[PDB]
Amino acid sequence: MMYVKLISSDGHEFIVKREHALTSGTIKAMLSETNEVNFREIPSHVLSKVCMYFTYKVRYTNSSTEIPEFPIAPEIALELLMAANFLDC
């Protein structure tokens, strides 16, 4: 498959499938011409949760099957929100 790379502010590089990342129009526009995207304001403990949300959304969109909750630990709840607010995820 086709993979792209998302780099956090603290240097962590997450490699995710292109189709999974293209659910977000923000990442889709950030790609266009590139397979590498750098997020200088999103730390790894947040961007990892973002990639997890990518997988969760691709798996559970359009399911009669019981959809589980997406877990958010309190310690990241603020920063993730800000990240989400900046990416419209």
Partner: protein, 141 residues
């Protein structure tokens, strides 16, 4: 505009909570007013008596977050065929990451202290706009 038709035609329904939330069933009366009904604990099912043409929506009992019934927002009981009740399957929607984070922060922060958080003021305003059935009904219309 959105209101229940007083059909007086019975329809037995199964409210099935396939979500991890305490579900509040809201019936819309003949005048268009939301009516609250007894809650369902997570993973529980109840057999109810309702009527054809009636309008039902489903919420988080504690937070009023929107929930999906049979993969749509509104449930209308239909005719029972061969005595089989009609399933209303209440599931979790695929929330946007922003709405889920807002839910978490709302569950963690008292409404008094939303402004004390170190976030953009836009986000304070977003936090204060927590789910409300009446506004959702108005937009629908």
């Amino acid at each position: 505009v959105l209101r229940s038709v007083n059909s007086r035609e019975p329809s037995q329904v199964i409210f099935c909570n396939r979500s991890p939330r305490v579900v509040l069933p809201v019936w819309l009366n003949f005048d268009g007013e939301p009516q609250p009904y007894p809650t369902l604990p997570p993973g529980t099912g109840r057999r109810i008596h309702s009527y054809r043409g009636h309008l039902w929506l489903f919420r988080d009992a504690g937070t009023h977050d929107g929930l999906l019934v049979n993969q749509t927002e509104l449930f209308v009981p239909s005719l029972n065929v061969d005595g089989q009740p009609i399933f209303a399957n209440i599931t979790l929607p695929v929330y946007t990451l922003k709405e889920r984070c807002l839910q978490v922060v709302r569950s963690l922060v008292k409404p008094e202290n939303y402004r004390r958080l170190d976030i953009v003021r836009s986000l304070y305003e977003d936090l204060e706009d927590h789910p409300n059935v009446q506004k959702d009904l108005e937009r629908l219309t």
